[PDB]
Design a binder for these strands. Sequence first.
DNA 1: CCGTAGGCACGTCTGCTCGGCTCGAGTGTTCGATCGCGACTGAGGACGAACGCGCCCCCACCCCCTTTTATAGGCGCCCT
Length: 406
Amino acid sequence: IIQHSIPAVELRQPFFPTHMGPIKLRQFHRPPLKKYSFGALSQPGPHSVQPLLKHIKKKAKMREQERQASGGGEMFFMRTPQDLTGKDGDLILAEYSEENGPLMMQVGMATKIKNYYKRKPGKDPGAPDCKYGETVYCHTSPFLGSLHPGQLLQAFENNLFRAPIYLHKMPETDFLIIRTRQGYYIRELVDIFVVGQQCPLFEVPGPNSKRANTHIRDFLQVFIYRLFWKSKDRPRRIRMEDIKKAFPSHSESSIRKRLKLCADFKRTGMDSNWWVLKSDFRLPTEEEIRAMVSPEQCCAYYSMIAAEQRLKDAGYGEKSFKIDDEVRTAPWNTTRAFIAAMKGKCLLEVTGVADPTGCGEGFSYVKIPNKSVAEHQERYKEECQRIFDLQNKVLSSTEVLSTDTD
DNA sequence: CCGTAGGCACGTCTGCTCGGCTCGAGTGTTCGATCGCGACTGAGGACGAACGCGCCCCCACCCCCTTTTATAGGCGCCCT
């Protein structure tokens, strides 16, 4: 059970962008430092980097007191955008080995760490302890390969994906800088996980699929309801211009569709007119709005449009998505293939063009039929096992390489 | 007679309707594969017929009964 932060659950901006142009899609999950137009750090010259130690201790203390003040047990702390800052709480880094994994979290979403352990035969004294995560004793593997007896494997686990992770040490040279309009802050950060290839648990839709079109529609609908809720006017009213600015690729006519059932156009002598909430229309509750569209569904959709943009950039037209190698790497194909195989509907290529590492240390998620048929499945498991073990060994290794001069 | 107001026209924006295109779903037909049945072949075992071997009988061949006579050494037995 995953409980996301309130800003994420509410699909607030900027945590959940309403629109992304080509540039943003290319930079998806890699935001570049952009200059500020105003505020302290818009100014030239040196700027102080501030310590956070007193602040970190204080927030931990305040949070624990709030915990004891009601009057123990479990509390949920991620209620406001302010609670999501890197400025307090314990922090880890996670570095993703896939250049563009099929699903990624937005800021404000939650994930668990699970410590998968397989018992040694006979008298097992229990799993080793880890600094992070909750131990899970598993007789069957949640991955493509099987755990060996006595093997502990850490992993990220959420509704988008499961992925093995490997704990490493941050280099002694490195610090985390947090940057706001107001100043820089610095934190020590020692724990950094390498993330291995994802096992997708959520299916990414194809471009212009019914699923995709239903999603943008519903997301637009949610944004609209939230606009009415934000309005302080009675009767509530919103401006077309504000919707168009958030959804610049929607025609005014398609926006009028979403508005015709809940609101009335009020014309004024000025090129700004209002849509006023109908007096017999009951605005959906917070709880009902949340049920309309989940953060996971937004993540699936984002994955599609970003991939679609990268494909266009590489010369692959919409008619391409009998199929080109590059199109096989698309998240709508890889997630579909992996999930089908998880349900026993087919097997996976494993060795193939969709291996995200390009060098045999990752899996190619491409459907092959279940179609000597005990040898067919034993060969699939053997190959899965080999790559599974290879990935764990390479990504957990502390060996120092050796810059490639090419 | 002069100035102000009103009306008309034009443009822009929004909404509604109509048409066209695309996508999806379902149903039907055709093709391929699998399964089943039958036939053939091969192998092994059993039964019957023919040939060979073994056993018994028969046949064949040779000498063994006797007589005669000349000759003469050695043996053993009868009663003188």
